[PDB]
RNA sequence: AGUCUCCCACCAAUUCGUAUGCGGAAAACGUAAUGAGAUUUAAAAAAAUUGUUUAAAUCAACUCAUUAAGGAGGAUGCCC
RNA sequence: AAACCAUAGUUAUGACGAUUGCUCUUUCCCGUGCUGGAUCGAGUAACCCAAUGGAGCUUACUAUUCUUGGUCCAUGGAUU
RNA sequence: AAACACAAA
């Protein structure tokens, strides 16, 4: 397939309340100040920055993770149509993650746009993503299979 | 020709065209990309079937016909870059010297 | 190369059973045609139109080239083809060519009336047009019709082997041949010998002398027996074997593996050709450089 | 050869009073310069003629859309 | 009751004989060559045919079933 | 036969 398996990645139900907890950590990090924001934690919230970080400029850290809000009406579907392809072709192990909450547009209301590119080297990032790689890992290349484009 | 056997032939031909659209050279060479794009579209126009818009919009280019792909099988990236808006968000390619603009 | 396309089979209706004497005489006449010299022989089978076609496929061909002609070819060295002539006079509803055309190789017609002639010239998919040289001609043959037919395909056939039957038939045979040659503009003429026994056969020189005495030049006779006979064999062979002239089931490598020439190799119960792998992707494209 | 077109009385004008790229009495007539086009098209595919019956890498071929005649001044390019 | 009129004119355009020329092949000479010359041979094509006259267009022809000129980002071989 | 027709096929 090309997109038939692409929008709906996750099939689990244990995370959402702890998703709320990490969102609370996000607002905790957003409270302090512009510099206190970005000094200890590797966060990007600018589409141009998302592209330039995955372009291949710096290759230091392997585990990179994106968090985007999707599959809810009236969103830039045409524009996030190309971000999973970028997350796959990127040489870094980039785990695209999708907010399964249509009501979680407060993310869109808080930082910039409803997406967040993070680089997992903090040990709490280790703690919470080493348990989510157990949970969700779904990323393929359409050029490989191309068996179910969209028949019947 | 059986129509039940013709449906399978149609699916197989569409899959074959879509696979020929891909592998190495249609990504590399703009000529083969455009030719195979035209062939696939002339083949899908004859079957009286519409194609999905979610792919129709952001699939190929308008000047050459290569798939918009940024950086199992390592290949060449399709597009020069993809900026932010900067006034309006655009996408540029490698093969040709043009860009495609979209507004929010 | 010489081709004889109207060797008659001693059977007219399906209710008839062929005795061993007729098969022995046919084997003898095939040997006779081969000894003096010949290249292609296509035996003929004649049935009428108002008869009831049997609703079979594996019983439509009482020729069995693999059974007895398979006994004869390995010692003879030539090939045989099965052809059928349709005696159609009145356009009745009996019409089942979709089976006999694919079962046989060459399909001809024998019109007696004008309406049958018109329908066989326009709609009926046939290969050769044979007239009853024994009886009288149906009408005054037109020129434009025959020219458009030979430009569209089907050509006329002249059988000099019937003039050896009796005395009273020679005048009618000559009168019909003259009209056919005058109306056909000497373009689509194919010559054949309808002999039932080896004693009524002749040499190519006797044939060309007879036809040059009839009115057709000898060089045209040689050309129509060399190229036109091969072409009318090819058309009737690949119209049934292959599709409508788009995809061929036979691949000619050298000079003997031809769809009309290669007859024992190509399967007939199906249309496949099981050959060992002889085309790879690592071999050099240029045949002058490619060496094994 | 062909089930194509037209001339084979005129009309200072209800009579194609048509100075319209050129030649021509007319013609489903010849040809010249440029741009574009392919059942997604102005129109060819799932009146006559022709077995195949324009094209669809480039060339070649078909179709359509513009360019009114003569004299004078300035600029550019060539022999000079 | 005629207007009856064709450098073919109304189902006609015959019959053979002789001469030159044209295309290839088996030969000899001067200067290489020369729509240079002479013997041994094969072929003179096809579409097809007027019925009142002229022009335009399209469609059939030329493979040992005569020929001619040019072109080709067609391929095949060789030199730079 | 040819030649003719807002025929007929
Ligand atoms: Mg005439
Ligand atoms: Mg006529
Ligand atoms: Mg006429
Ligand atoms: Zn391009």
UniProtKB/Swiss-Prot annotation, chain A:
Organism superkingdom: Eukaryota
Biological process, per Gene Ontology: intronic box C/D snoRNA processing; maturation of 5.8S rRNA; nuclear-transcribed mRNA catabolic process, RNase MRP-dependent; rRNA processing; tRNA 5'-leader removal; tRNA processing
Record-level GO cellular component terms: cytosol; nucleolar ribonuclease P complex; nucleus; ribonuclease MRP complex
Note: Present with 1360 molecules/cell in log phase SD medium.
Task of the protein: Required for processing of 5.8S rRNA (short form) at site A3 and for 5'- and 3'-processing of pre-tRNA.
Subunit field text: Component of nuclear RNase P and RNase MRP complexes. RNase P consists of an RNA moiety and at least 9 protein subunits including POP1, POP3, POP4, POP5, POP6, POP7, POP8, RPP1 and RPR2. RNase MRP complex consists of an RNA moiety and at least 10 protein subunits including POP1, POP3, POP4, POP5, POP6, POP7, POP8, RMP1, RPP1 and SNM1, many of which are shared with the RNase P complex.
Entry similarity comment: Belongs to the POP3 family.
Protein name: Ribonucleases P/MRP protein subunit POP3
Organism: Saccharomyces cerevisiae (strain ATCC 204508 / S288c)
From Swiss-Prot, chain B:
One Gene Ontology cellular component annotation held by this UniProt entry: ribonuclease MRP complex
UniProt record, GO biological process: maturation of 5.8S rRNA; mRNA processing; plasmid partitioning; rRNA processing; tRNA processing
TM stretches of this protein: none
Record's keyword terms, sorted: Hydrolase, Nuclease, Nucleus, RNA-binding, rRNA processing
Location relative to the cell: Nucleus
GO molecular function, one term: nuclease activity
Note: Present with 172 molecules/cell in log phase SD medium.
Function: Essential component of the MRP ribonucleoprotein endoribonuclease that cleaves mitochondrial primer RNA sequences.
Assembly information from the UniProt record: Component of RNase MRP complex which consists of an RNA moiety and at least 10 protein subunits including POP1, POP3, POP4, POP5, POP6, POP7, POP8, RMP1, RPP1 and SNM1, many of which are shared with the RNase P complex.
Protein name: Ribonuclease MRP protein subunit SNM1
Residue window of the full protein shown: 1 to 117 of 198
Swiss-Prot record, chain C:
An example Gene Ontology CC term for this record: cytosol
InterPro entries attached to this UniProt entry: Pol/histidinol_Pase-like, RNase_P_p30
Annotated EC: 3.1.26.5
Enzyme class: hydrolase
UniProt subcellular location: Nucleus
Reaction catalysis annotation: Endonucleolytic cleavage of RNA, removing 5'-extranucleotides from tRNA precursor
GO molecular function, one term: ribonuclease P activity
Single GO biological process annotation from the record: nuclear-transcribed mRNA catabolic process, RNase MRP-dependent
Keyword line: Hydrolase, Nucleus, rRNA processing, tRNA processing
More info: Present with 6300 molecules/cell in log phase SD medium.
UniProt family annotation: Belongs to the eukaryotic/archaeal RNase P protein component 3 family.
Subunit structure of this chain's protein: Component of nuclear RNase P and RNase MRP complexes. RNase P consists of an RNA moiety and at least 9 protein subunits including POP1, POP3, POP4, POP5, POP6, POP7, POP8, RPP1 and RPR2. RNase MRP complex consists of an RNA moiety and at least 10 protein subunits including POP1, POP3, POP4, POP5, POP6, POP7, POP8, RMP1, RPP1 and SNM1, many of which are shared with the RNase P complex.
Function per UniProt: Component of ribonuclease P, a protein complex that generates mature tRNA molecules by cleaving their 5'-ends. Also a component of RNase MRP, which cleaves pre-rRNA sequences.
This protein's name: Ribonuclease P/MRP protein subunit RPP1
Organism: Saccharomyces cerevisiae (strain ATCC 204508 / S288c)
